[PDB]
Design a protein around this ligand. Sequence first.
Ligand SMILES: CCCCCCCCCCCCCCCCCC(=O)OC[C@H](COP(=O)(O)OCCN)OC(=O)CCCCCCCCCCCCCCCCC
Lengths: 347, 99, 54, 69, 140, 56, 53, 121, 459
Amino acid sequence: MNPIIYTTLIMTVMSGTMLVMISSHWLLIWIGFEMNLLAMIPVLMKNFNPRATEAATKYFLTQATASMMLMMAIIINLLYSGQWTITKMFNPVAMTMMTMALAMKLGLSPFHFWVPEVTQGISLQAGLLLLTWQKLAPLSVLCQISQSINPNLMLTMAMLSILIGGWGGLNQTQLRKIMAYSSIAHMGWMTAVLPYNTTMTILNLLIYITMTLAMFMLLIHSSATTTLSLSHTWNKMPVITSLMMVTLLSMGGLPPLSGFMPKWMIIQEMTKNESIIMPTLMAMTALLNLYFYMRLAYSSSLTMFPSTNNMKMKWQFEHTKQMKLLPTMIVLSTLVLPMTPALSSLN
Amino acid sequence: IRLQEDPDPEDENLYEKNPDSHGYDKDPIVDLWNMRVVFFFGFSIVLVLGSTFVAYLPDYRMQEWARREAERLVKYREANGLPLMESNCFDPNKIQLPE
Amino acid sequence: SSLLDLIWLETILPKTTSFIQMKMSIMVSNQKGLIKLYFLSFLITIMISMTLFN
Amino acid sequence: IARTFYDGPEKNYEKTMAILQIEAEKAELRLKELEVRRLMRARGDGPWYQYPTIDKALIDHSPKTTPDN
Amino acid sequence: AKTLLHKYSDIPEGTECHRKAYASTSIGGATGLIVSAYSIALKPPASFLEGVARTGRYTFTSAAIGAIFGLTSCISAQVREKPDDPLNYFIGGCAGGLTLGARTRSYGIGAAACAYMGLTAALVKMGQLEGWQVFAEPKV
Amino acid sequence: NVLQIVRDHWVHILVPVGFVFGCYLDRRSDEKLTAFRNKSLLFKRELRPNEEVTWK
Amino acid sequence: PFFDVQKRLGLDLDRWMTIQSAEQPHKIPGRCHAFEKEWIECAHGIGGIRAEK
Amino acid sequence: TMMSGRPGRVPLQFLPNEARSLPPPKLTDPRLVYMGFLGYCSGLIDNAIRRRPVVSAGLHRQLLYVTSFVFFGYYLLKRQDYMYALRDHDMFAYVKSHPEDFPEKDKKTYGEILEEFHPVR
Amino acid sequence: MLKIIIPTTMLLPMTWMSKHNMIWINATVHSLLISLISLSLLNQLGENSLNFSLTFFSDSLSAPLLVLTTWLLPLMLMASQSHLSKETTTRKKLYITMLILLQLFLIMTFTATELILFYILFEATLVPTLIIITRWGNQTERLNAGLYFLFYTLAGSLPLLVALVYIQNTTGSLNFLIIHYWSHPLSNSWSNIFMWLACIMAFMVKMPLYGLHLWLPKAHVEAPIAGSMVLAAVLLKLGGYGMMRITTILNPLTNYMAYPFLMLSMWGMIMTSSICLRQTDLKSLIAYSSVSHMALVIVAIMIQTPWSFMGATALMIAHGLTSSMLFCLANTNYERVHSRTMILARGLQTLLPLMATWWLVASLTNLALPPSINLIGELFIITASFSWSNITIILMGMNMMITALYSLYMLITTQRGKYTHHINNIKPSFTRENALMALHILPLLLLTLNPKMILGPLY
Ligand SMILES: CCCCCCCCCCCCCCCCCC(=O)OC[C@H](COP(=O)(O)OCCN)OC(=O)CCCCCCCCCCCCCCCCC
């Protein structure tokens, strides 16, 4: 792919998301979604191989079905209200269809399989962009339409997402599938807190994006896509393994790291509204995520797996490409707990 | 065999290379000064000075003050024929029972 | 030592929970990645959400 | 030792009084804020929870093709 | 599901044990049908007869669990003359867990199911008594 | 060699200066809680002829 | 979520098409122009909750 | 969403004109010091990742890290203080406007209040 | 409290900027200086605590624990010197950094004035301990030990976080002074029962409680010497401190919910002592003895009488010191013979006289020989339990008999008898090891001389 074409497609994806986030018209929001998907498909199919083609095909099918459902919901809402402005939807059936379409776009359970499938199919940069941006946009739409969301359905989908992410991450071995299930669990947390405080939703989004960027960029730096491939990193650059370990600890919600702040704020907000059982179950279920994070950290940082012989040549040579904002994302993902009251600024 | 692994090394004895070893370091001078600073600081400073400091800490718990106040109250009570210990902690005149 | 500490106290809390989580993880991730299958699951979820949610 | 390393009981006493005042005020403010948030979300007559509505400036009041607009 | 739950809650606790058991059996049958549909969708059966057999097995297991729970809880409450007691729900839940263990032919599964189901049924009864809500409406 | 002594033993002032800074910060925090100074019922007292604050 | 660039910069990207009581070509009125105008003028400036109530 | 939709809110404005009536954060603020500490840590991590002497290489870029973090932290603190002040102002206004919803209660002394005593034995 | 907090955050850069051969010397010297500075916190008042600021305060319960932590750090440094000779400079500095961070988190946890900050720091202590165990442990089971430890603690403590945020929303503040002055009785309902369960179960899993204690042998056996020293002496006391702090708002429901935990704790004392009778591993014996002592502390806290809190505090301090000394002795014996089996090496009194003396003194302090603070705390707890009921005396008596039995059993097995013929690498005891044992044992006798400093705020 030509660099000019690649940057044009990236800017088209970003422009589609910006159009979705700045448009007050349902037709314009749908147009932004269509543009985002259209420009996103080649980014997935950059490195051409049958696995990438299959991942792109599955992603296209899922996103097209979600877009059709979203347009149907828009039309149904227009039928009973005659309004195009994105506000509290005036029809429960249209609201349910919109919620299901946005859940399918985000990856919430039971619409989650395509997330690990595509993430394994595509490369690390494609997975990073996919997760981050393609979860950034529908969450903005949901935050705009929050006041009409059915709490029962939203919380059911959120809890299912958390459980499914935990169990999938427990069983998986591939780094990209682990990241996909982590994304599913964090989206579950965000959508669980969504019907109560969109500010907490945005805070969780920002923290999750920072941690995911840090983890994916560390994986790109180490050029590891499996557990055993990552197990050789300690013999070439042990600093990266330690940074990855602290990032994994933060993603598990362990205090006093940055990952504990979203869970803490969400628990507080949900327990303000006389909801105890849901926060308790959500907090207890994150232990599965922390378990597979710790299992991944054992193989890379806290132990020394056997190495190979060409690693000496690896030592002789030096990394050339420099990651952008990697130290900043590492610091922001582990040491911003004492700056929690900035959520008022985020408000 | 399954790996190109180093054999397990024999444990080194500090007394072999230094019969006067204190067990802190394999360098003789560093070992001697580590022992000296540990002994001096810990034993002398911490033990002796902290022990005498705690022994002569001022009576902020007011044990002696409480004893003197108790003696004064006992003297005043038994001089005037009043009971040594009152029946109630608070004043029933100030306490208003619900009725 | 053996009956209580090494066997039953290990069986109740940590071993049973670990076994349950392992079985659930196998059940969740045992999917074959068939678009027909999980799109049929999507259809079932859509019908359930449309009907049994008021 | 008391003259060199420590201070009188009055300092700690009045610092504790100030701390208690601050903490009691904060607790009262938190309870009041929760009550205000609950009432505002329930009713909608306050500055908070003001969900958007259609602006009236978009309406066109010019005469139309038919008198019965 | 809401209609079935409303019927079950509208039937009085200590009385009408047959109707309570019928409501619980209906709830269990609906749950079993949903589970069977998801299982067939995700793991396809070899043949239509095998799919029908799997659906029947799941539905019968769930309906038996529900019926046993309802009957045991209502009978215990009636004989003890002590309604609004989580112990009746605990007994019903353990009975349902033992029924599941009998259906699966596994003593360990039966014991674990009895314990967990009794605990969660006691929790449900305590929530009914105390006013606990799982999906709380946005309040603050 | 005096520079080498400093270049090797300059880390022995970090803990002492940290202790001094901690004492200074403790005093500065104590100066922010003077709302009830010489105002408690138990220790309310007329100031001495040469005195402005009961405690610092 | 909603960066109101249109309101910030004074643009009209889609607010013309948002409602059917706005400026139409050749002043063609909508089917329910009067009802929509009355509803908008009632619900304007009081918030979503009060508008619905 | 609570604050969004507040009357008089100009979109995409980090600090409105009414925020200038509040005391700006002191340059010796502990939060600003923590932001500078985060910048210094980011510089050290940059040196470690790029395989340079951690505490002695790239002094100019470490200084730039610290300066950028301090700058953004100062503006973030200003916005945070403005938001909290606005929240308190709205709360007090609503409490004033709804006295029947926020009434004063009688203060009974503990001599009048009857409370049950539970012995510990 | 900043005068103690800042010197640790200065220990960090000093450790990372010191020379390769001076790290241990600098760390030990400045840790001793910080301990001397922290000795000033023992000057507590009689009525109210020391309120330094809105964030940190010191009480008669917090001060001895802070002094114990600041005193325990340099001993861990000495043990690390012992077992980390061949490590690289960067890894040694990382180990010292982990120890320093753990000490700082413990200090802030003990001096925190609010329950949520207390929870944050008390959970923050998990990371350094897990890293130390799973990174510098010697055997394969260190990963499993770390997993068990972390997940037991988190499964205990998450409902505590939910309960804490609920309590703040309901009452207004989590400040300890406010929740003590504004305390109101807890009604006997299911919701209050479950809140009580959340808080108490969190601290009991941390304590640990019998039945929730397997993580303790797993982690203590497989941890390095410094990790074992900090796990047994200080990290076990977080649960006791929390229970002594959190029970202010749980009355009178504690009078009704304490029965299962009291029975569990007493029968756990009995069971763990009996387990100690037949242990083939020395570290496991010490770990189970720690479990028994913590169960006794649990009984004291649950009965919750003024004579039981003083005994609880004294027993916590005494057990911390005694367990640290026992672990150090066991580690010396292990480093001599590279095996934890107790019957492998014998005749150690013939081969090493001074270590035999240290073993005798440590085992005498373990079995609560009067007038040691171990016995002071145990006797206060026993008297309070006797006032509570008159069969607790039977249970305490049999527990005490079995405790003496297994203490003297391990002493006789390790030190007395005929030396193993084929073990010919028993070098004379090092001055470092002798000084470590002396620094462990002398403060115990000094606290015996002056016992009012460790009897808590109810003295
Ligand atoms: C804190 C201190 C410690 C406190 C806790 C201590 C531990 C307490 C619990 C101990 C364990 C009790 C039993 C729990 C599991 C029971 C189920 C089980 O073990 O299943 C496995 C096994 C499967 O057997 P299978 O493979 O079919 O064939 C082999 C032989 N037939 O199944 C079998 O073989 C079935 C054998 C059943 C034999 C009878 C069991 C009776 C005891 C269990 C019920 C106790 C009820 C207590 C109620 C108290 C109420 C107040």
